[PDB]
Amino acid sequence: AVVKCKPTSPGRRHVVKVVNPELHKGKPFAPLLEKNSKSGGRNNNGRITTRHIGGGHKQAYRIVDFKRNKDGIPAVVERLEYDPNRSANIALVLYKDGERRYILAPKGLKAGDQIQSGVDAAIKPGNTLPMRNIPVGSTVHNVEMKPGKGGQLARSAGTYVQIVARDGAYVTLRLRSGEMRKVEADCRATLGEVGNAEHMLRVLGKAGAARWRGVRPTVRGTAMNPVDHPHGGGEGRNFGKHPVTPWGVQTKGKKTRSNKRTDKFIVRRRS
Amino acid sequence: MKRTFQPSVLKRNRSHGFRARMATKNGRQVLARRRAKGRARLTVSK
RNA sequence: AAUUCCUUGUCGGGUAAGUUCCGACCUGCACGAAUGGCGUAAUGAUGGCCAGGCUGUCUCCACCCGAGACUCAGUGAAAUU
RNA sequence: GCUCGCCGGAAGACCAAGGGUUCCUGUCCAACGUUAAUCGGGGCAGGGUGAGUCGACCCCUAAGGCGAGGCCGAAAGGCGUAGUCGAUGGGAAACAGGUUAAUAUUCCUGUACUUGGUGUUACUGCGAAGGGGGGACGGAGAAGGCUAUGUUGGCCGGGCGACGGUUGUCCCGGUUUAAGCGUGUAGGCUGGUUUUCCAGGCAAAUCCGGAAAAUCAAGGCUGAGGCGUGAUGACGAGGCACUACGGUGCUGAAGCAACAAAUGCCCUGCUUCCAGGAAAAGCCUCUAAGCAUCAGGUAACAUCAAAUCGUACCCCAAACCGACACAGGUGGUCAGGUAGAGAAUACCAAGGCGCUUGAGAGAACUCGGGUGAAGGAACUAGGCAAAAUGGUGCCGUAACUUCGGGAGAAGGCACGCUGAUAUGUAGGUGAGGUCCCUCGCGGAUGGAGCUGAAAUCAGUCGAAGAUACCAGCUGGCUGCAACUGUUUAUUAAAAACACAGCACUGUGCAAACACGAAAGUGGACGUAUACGGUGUGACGCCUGCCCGGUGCCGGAAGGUUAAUU
RNA sequence: AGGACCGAACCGACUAAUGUUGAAAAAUUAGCGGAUGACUUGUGGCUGGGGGUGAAAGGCCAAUCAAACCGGGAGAUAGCU
């Protein structure tokens, strides 16, 4: 549910929160936790390779099961948990043999729900099957690009993909970006959609909220000097040149895809 | 007013110590130059 | 007008007297809509203007309490030439 | 030595970092000390640092460093696996008293504790470079129970007053005692026990996880403080023989209660929030390969061992960083009294200091302050500076507004002391007694004693009662930026930069992009509700016309066109 | 509850005076801003010169920055003093 904070002070006037009472109000499952040290956008050379990264709250990594290869063993959802490493929520599931695992939380999955994976699994939300056995035209998420590699597509808060066609050993999918992509008809997918659709309705409301996320301020570039940025300076606000990144690329419509290795699984790139 | 030199023995040895100089080819050349000049104190070790 | 050269534009308000300030007029030298336009409560060691209180800021300075300046003993520099 | 003055959330006390003999004693005064110097952090000589428990070393790991093979690179070399290093973090154990000119939780006295080796005895499933548990963790807030500590009374010792009074509701001082061991309380958390079974924990497992039955409600874990013991001791104000008037033996009374109370402890708790909060070992368990009249394991007793290095002194400063015995800078710990909301402020305690030139004089002028007739911004670029306002309670408070604000708007009234209500009230604390009980650090009743606001009424002193220090000037119009923030260390703090929000655009994951001759790394252990770039800059109402030029995105006929042949 | 309010420590540096061969190669005195946070601080670590870092001033990178410091080419060159 989206809740608007009352304007008791500047910085709270425009804050909009996303409150989900179903989330577990306790510590996470310790056995599935790992250390996650921040980098500040610096690589092994010590140089800043990605700007605007630094600070933020300390976080611990949750080992999420993106493969879902535990076939034939039913599992029951124990609770939903908050994951600081991703926009979507996660669910702790207990299998019949006594093993526990973390999975992405679908739209309408709650505590006590039953899920299963495999070729013979039922067509229900939260169930993972090879896309060969999934009926065409259904909505799935956490799709595998290669068989047995782990889900890679449609993992965000409220994303999903639709199976459009299945001609031979491939299935055509419509990704959230609108691209029409085809992948092998042996990659696993999970029925339903990732459930956090309200995630996009939040409003940070102040500069400090962005800093909590580890995002550092962005300096435009027209406010710098010529030695620093192509947009340079000038007496006042001039900007008499075509928009360009640092390092000198147009970045106002110029395409940068130059892979060409596949260039065969794309049909309707987008727009 | 805080001045440039803030002593720290551990940092002094790690930056200019004898073992730090020996750790790199360029550092070993520093010792060779100082030995040729006849310096009494080769490094800041003590 | 943080933009108006002519210019202290013209009219009104405030003052005994207002090149600043506020409100209108439009002949916009040379405003104008995300290098955004026009408004806007709150906020500001931010720019401009007007009141009450307050006063040595001033008319116009007077006296007083301390540290130097002045004299004695000891120590004893500097720029420049 | 007697006075005076200053600091007292330090200008006192104890450390780290850093320094390295500056520490104590004797001796010297050339140089050093901004003067003299008998003195000194100065010269010279001698002396001084005592640890199984404090710290380091050591075991363990974070960021990160190095890195056998390996991958990559003209050479040099780069990255990185297994590993190995790396505290600012985790990991066994000592307290009080006494003592030196200079060291002490290190020496002495008293009383304790921890981890290992070996041996004896009794009883025995032991075994890891593997599994599980544990270690193990955020912000804010709220109380309740306590202690450090303070105040008063009682008790003990002493005192009877340089000037009126002072045998009393009078004055001064003391009234201290640890770790350890036993007890397991305020309070926090969790339902226990037994049996059977299983696709999980790389194999195994009696352990962890899961499932199904039976049987009981009391089981366990954690836990400040208090009490007992430690202690027939130690300490103890003051006396008494020695007393080079520098000081040592012996002796040494009281040593209780109430109240108040922390920012410390219970609390790594509890409640709540979103931004969702290290690792590894020690430790506790589980078995595998193995070993079984062995070896090993648990317990008792005895015995042995616990090495090595640091330990002086300064440490908000004359000893460290600033060329100086320099109005500078420097992290942690301790936190008394009166007033006070307070670690502000004023005066004091313990303790420490008067800052290494003085002596006179009482001109101009400069610096730092006090007061001022009448006028009150006439000063000036400008109310610069100065003056002024200043506390608590109650009454009262406009336009405008995003309904929160504006607002402490503005403005007004009351404040001391004494008595009474009430020989000290409301409230807080709580003894004895009585009763109950699973007879305990228990529960109920009970109210002694102690502590103690605020208000009303009456009286009373001064020019003035928030009297000192301390402690908002207020209101009206308007430009700019929404706001809190950031910035030219050392002439610019702003209207500049950030900002939440908005838009365009790129990016299908071996992502775009960035650092790299490369390997590779960041992006991201993320996956289009994501990430990069660009412009705009809360919010409200809105964002019109132009694609000729430049750029970008598509197009497919024709023209032109490189190497090559 | 709060990049909430008043206000010490703590972190800053808006105004004035003094100082300017200073006590100090940027400080002192009286006022002033923030003061639960985009806060502040100790220890250690990483980024290296056409490079780093930069809430962006051409700021900062050992009192030095429109290209640090040290050594070398080097007795660079100087139609100029």
Tab-separated table of N, CA, C and O (backbone and C1' of nucleotides) in Angstrom, chain A residues 256-261, chain D residues 507-508 512-513:
chain	number	residue	atom	x	y	z
A	256	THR	N	24.375	2.174	-29.641
A	256	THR	CA	25.664	1.651	-29.211
A	256	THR	C	25.753	0.132	-29.255
A	256	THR	O	26.815	-0.415	-28.940
A	257	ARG	N	24.685	-0.566	-29.634
A	257	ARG	CA	24.749	-2.020	-29.740
A	257	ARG	C	25.630	-2.407	-30.920
A	257	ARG	O	25.316	-2.087	-32.071
A	258	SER	N	26.733	-3.094	-30.634
A	258	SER	CA	27.653	-3.563	-31.663
A	258	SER	C	28.123	-4.973	-31.344
A	258	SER	O	29.296	-5.313	-31.532
A	259	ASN	N	27.217	-5.815	-30.847
A	259	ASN	CA	27.600	-7.169	-30.465
A	259	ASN	C	27.782	-8.054	-31.693
A	259	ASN	O	28.886	-8.539	-31.965
A	260	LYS	N	26.702	-8.285	-32.437
A	260	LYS	CA	26.755	-9.012	-33.701
A	260	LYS	C	27.087	-10.489	-33.517
A	260	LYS	O	27.046	-11.254	-34.485
A	261	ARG	N	27.405	-10.911	-32.292
A	261	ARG	CA	27.690	-12.324	-32.070
A	261	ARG	C	26.435	-13.159	-32.261
A	261	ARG	O	26.445	-14.154	-32.993
D	507	U	P	20.819	0.783	-28.049
D	507	U	O5'	21.069	-0.052	-26.717
D	507	U	C5'	22.383	-0.404	-26.315
D	507	U	C4'	22.415	-0.957	-24.912
D	507	U	C3'	21.543	-2.172	-24.646
D	507	U	O3'	22.140	-3.381	-25.083
D	507	U	C1'	21.288	-0.602	-22.891
D	508	G	P	21.360	-4.374	-26.076
D	508	G	O5'	21.512	-5.801	-25.389
D	508	G	C5'	20.877	-6.080	-24.149
D	508	G	C4'	20.527	-7.541	-24.005
D	508	G	C3'	20.148	-8.254	-25.299
D	508	G	O3'	20.509	-9.634	-25.212
D	508	G	C1'	18.302	-8.266	-23.833
D	512	A	P	28.367	-4.336	-24.071
D	512	A	O5'	27.929	-2.808	-24.129
D	512	A	C5'	27.083	-2.330	-25.163
D	512	A	C4'	26.369	-1.070	-24.748
D	512	A	C3'	27.259	0.077	-24.294
D	512	A	O3'	27.780	0.828	-25.376
D	512	A	C1'	25.509	-0.230	-22.733
D	513	C	P	29.366	0.942	-25.599
D	513	C	O5'	29.877	1.757	-24.332
D	513	C	C5'	29.341	3.035	-24.025
D	513	C	C4'	29.538	3.380	-22.572
D	513	C	C3'	30.974	3.386	-22.074
D	513	C	O3'	31.676	4.570	-22.406
D	513	C	C1'	29.629	2.191	-20.553
